[PDB]
């Protein structure tokens, strides 16, 4: 069963927000897959990345920003995400999160130019509440929340 929330960002510029959000969602009982938790490195990930997108990822959160707009790895991720979304026929698969204020809504990339984004330009807590409400309305799988997991993950990594 697909129970992993995938996060795609533009390393290294989007690390503060992604660390904050990933630890927040880990503390809220979700199972977040982003490349920054598995920063131990040493093993190739492209095959692993596509495998986790196609096999277990249930939601593809995309950090839309002035850096991740034209990043090649994020573009490949969006291509695979579009393919798996069409395979699953799920309209609510990819969720952009607008974070950069200087990224105008008229210069957004073609692959997310039509989807309804979640706005973090004003407040991170407002956007987080939007994310949580959207997830609970879309019945995203989750277990009981525990801040201990976020604590030990932050300590380990």
């Amino acid at each position: 069963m697909r129970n992993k929330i995938f996060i795609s960002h533009a390393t290294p510029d989007d690390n503060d927000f992604t660390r904050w959000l990933a630890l927040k969602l880990i503390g809220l009982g979700y199972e977040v897959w982003c490349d920054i938790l598995f920063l131990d490195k040493g093993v190739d990930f492209w095959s692993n990345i596509e495998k986790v997108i196609r096999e277990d990822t249930c939601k593809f959160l995309l950090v839309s920003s002035s850096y991740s707009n034209q990043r090649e790895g994020v573009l490949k991720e969006l291509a695979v995400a579009a393919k798996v979304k069409k395979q699953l026929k799920d309209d609510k698969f990819i969720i952009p999160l607008a974070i950069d204020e200087q990224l105008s809504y008229d210069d957004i990339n073609i692959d997310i130019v039509r989807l309804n984004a979640i706005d973090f330009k004003m407040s991170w807590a407002r956007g987080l509440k939007d994310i949580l409400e959207a997830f609970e309305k879309q019945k995203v799988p989750k277990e009981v929340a525990d801040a201990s997991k976020s604590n030990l993950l932050y300590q380990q990594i």
Binding site: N15, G27, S123, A125, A147, S150
Partner: protein
Amino acid sequence: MKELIYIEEPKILFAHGQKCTDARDGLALFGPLNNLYGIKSGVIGTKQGLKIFRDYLDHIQKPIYNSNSITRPMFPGFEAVFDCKWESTGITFKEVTNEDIGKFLYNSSTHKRTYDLVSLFIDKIISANKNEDENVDVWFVIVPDEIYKYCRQFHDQFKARLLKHTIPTQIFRESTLAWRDFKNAFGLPIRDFSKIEGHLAWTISTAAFYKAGGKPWKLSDVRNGVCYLGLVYKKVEKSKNPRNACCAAQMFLDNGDGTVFKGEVGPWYNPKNGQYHLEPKEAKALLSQSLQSYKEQIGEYPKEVFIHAKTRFNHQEWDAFLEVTPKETNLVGVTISKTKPLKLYKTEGDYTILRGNAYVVNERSAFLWTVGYVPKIQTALSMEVPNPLFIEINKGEADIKQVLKDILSLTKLNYNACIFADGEPVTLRFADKIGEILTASTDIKTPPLAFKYY
């Protein structure tokens, strides 16, 4: 050849019982102990000060960044951290005209200008507090760079003249909030915050959240039945004598369940200059008030009282302390100094000594590098070689290891700032703060005892 024993860093407990080593990271990840619904802000100052406070309040709603996010973690935003609304829409402004400021500022006397300016400010605050329908939690007094420059005396008198009314207040300078535009005549910003801005937001938000009834964190590893008293001595310059010694104390117990930190005060006076010793009556009064303050909250007497200080007690006052205590409480007394320049250099020549190193001279003396190198943020707390605290057990019998552990734990609970740790235990620093405030106006009966008023 000498040995250095290492004392590990303690943990400060954040929301839902999650231990951590840094206050900033724990708050940005877990949250504070108690939740406020919001902060209702009253602003005193000119129209420009109101505009500046409004824009800064809007600014700290968004995430802020430092240059290097390892030395100083970034600020997610006020609501993301504290789960509280502190917006510019809750502003209850009380306008103060510039001519009003000028008509007391442009006099010739030095004490009278400060007296009149503080008088006008506190009268406006008290009028707004007594007979306005709104409820204001913290009053934010924005001052221009034309009062505090020529009023030093302003801050101490300001905080002393609001004591009988108990209004939590925070003083700001227009350059602190508007550093970007408040450059010199040369155009150089004299208060460059461009590389620290996130840390400035952290400290300001933590102070504001504390003064509005919120507890941001606490201590997780401390034993029950013990109490600590930080005793400081201050000079009363405005008394009849040129100097009149006054003792002020800050109390720290745990609680029936956790984290009580109040401060039993009311300055105990010594008339003769240069004698930083409490007369037997003063010592009995102070110790009895402290013991009652502990007992009426816990219900039982403490199992240990740990009177910190900066000076060494003599036999008279220690005997007096021993008379006013029952036969179960073990009484210790430790004097902490900074007059032994043991600047322990490093053989690598890249960074300073690690924080937490202690040179234990004997069973009744030691050193402690409370300010040193902390690896979690890849930097030291100082710029030059730090000077360690020379901790000696002046009176009583106790374990020096426990003393060093307790001092290191007490170096954490500083709510006036959001940093990794302090350099001196918070009992001494906070007792110094409230003893400095209490002597600003020598007419005060039964002070509030709570730090958010100081």
